[PDB]
Symmetry: C2
C-alpha cells in the first residue's frame, strides 16, 4: 500500500477478519473427508501490493468460505461440523457454484490482479468475478447498483446497490504528540 | 422454536451477531444526518416464532445493514463514520437498492412471515425477497444454485450455490449428567 493510511487499513481489516471467522476449516482437513480444497484466503494470491486492500475488501467474508469438489462433500463436512461442535462454515461446491462476470469497462477487473489454481476458478469467479477496482468514490457513484466496485482505499459497492464504507482501523488509546517520555 | 435445539440455535445465532457487528448505527442517529431509517434488524418483525431461526439465518449480516433514503445519505454517513472513527457500516439506499423475487414454488417465501413498513420494502426485498423457507436439507438439495433457501433448522443455501451449515450453539464447559452437587 502506497499511503500509510492504506497500510493501516489493510492490517486492521485482516486482524478483524481473523477475530470473526472460524478456524474449523483446519479441523476439517483431519476428518478424512476428501474433496476439500481449503478456504479462498488460502487459495488466492494478490499479484500487486497496490491492490491488497481492494482485494481484502472485495473478498470480505468470502475469504473464509471453503472450496469443495461438490455438494456431497459439503453435506459430509457439515455433518462433521455438527458432530464435533465446530461451529459453521460456508462451502463452495465447484460443480454448483456460479461464476460472476464483468460486463463493463468502468475499471480493472479484480480477477486480473490475483493468481489462483485454474481448478478452483468457479469459486474464485463466484467471489470476485464481477468486481471492478476503481480509484475513488467519485469515479464510482454513477454505477451504484449496476457494477460491483471496490475502491483502492476500501469502499465497497455491491452490485445490488449496497454501499460499505468507513475505517477499518480503530481509534486506539490517544498518544501524546509531545515527547513526554523520551 | 418447537425443538429445544432450535431455540438454543437461535439464542446462539443472535448472541454471535451481537458480538460481530457495530453499534455505530446508534451514533449515526445523533449526527443530524437526515434520511437514516435504521438497521434491518430494527425494521423487521417475525410474524411467527416457528420461523425465527430461519429469518435470523436468512438475514445474516444484512440484519446490521442501515436503510437510508438515498446514496447521498450513505456518503454523508460514511464521512461521519470516518471523521469520528466509528468503524464501518453497509448502507441500503432506497432509490438504488435492488429487490429480489421468488421465481418458484419450492416453499414459503420468507417475506411472507415478516412484517415491515412498506416504505422500506426495497431494502427488505433486497435482503429476503428471493429467500424460500423449506423444511429440511433433503427437500433442498435438488435446487442448490437455482433457489435461495433456508431450512427451518438453519442451513442456508445461497442462490449462487454456496452452502452454510453447522451449529450456532457452542460446546461450552462439560456438565456432569450425574447430580454431584445437589
Amino acid at each position: 500500500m502506497e499511503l500509510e493510511s492504506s497500510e493501516r487499513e489493510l492490517i486492521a481489516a485482516e486482524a478483524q477478519r481473523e477475530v470473526r471467522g472460524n478456524r474449523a476449516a483446519e479441523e476439517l482437513k483431519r476428518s478424512g473427508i476428501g474433496g476439500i480444497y481449503g478456504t479462498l484466503a488460502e487459495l488466492i494470491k494478490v499479484k500487486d501490493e497496490a491492490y491488497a486492500l481492494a482485494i481484502e475488501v472485495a473478498l470480505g467474508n468470502r475469504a473464509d468460505n471453503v472450496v469443495v469438489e461438490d455438494e456431497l462433500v459439503a453435506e459430509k463436512a457439515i455433518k462433521y461440523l455438527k458432530e464435533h461442535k465446530l461451529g459453521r462454515l460456508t462451502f463452495l461446491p465447484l460443480n454448483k457454484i456460479k461464476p460472476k462476470h464483468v460486463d463493463s469497462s468502468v475499471g480493472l477487473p479484480a480477477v486480473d490482479v490475483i493468481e489462483y489454481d485454474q481448478k478452483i476458478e468457479n469459486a474464485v469467479k463466484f467471489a470476485l468475478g464481477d468486481t471492478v477496482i476503481v480509484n475513488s468514490m467519485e469515479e464510482a457513484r454513477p454505477h451504484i447498483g449496476k457494477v460491483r466496485m471496490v475502491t483502492i482505499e476500501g469502499e465497497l459497492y455491491e452490485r445490488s446497490g449496497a454501499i460499505t464504507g468507513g475505517h477499518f482501523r480503530a481509534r486506539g488509546l490517544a498518544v501524546d504528540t509531545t515527547k513526554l517520555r523520551l
